[PDB]
């Protein structure tokens, strides 16, 4: 199981995102898996 493309992330509370799809923490809640090339 994997999170998608711009699809909400948490340590505990988640997943671990789809490759190549990243989890973002921006500083800013929630933090969100996004598609890789950024």
């Given at each position: 199981?994997?999170?998608?493309?711009?699809?909400?992330?948490?340590?505990?509370?988640?997943?671990?995102?789809?490759?190549?799809?990243?989890?973002?923490?921006?500083?800013?809640?929630?933090?969100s898996c996004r598609p890789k090339g950024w």
């Open positions: 199981k994997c999170l998608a493309e711009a699809a909400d992330c948490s340590p505990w509370s988640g997943d671990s995102c789809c490759k190549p799809y990243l989890c973002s923490c921006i500083f800013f809640y929630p933090c």
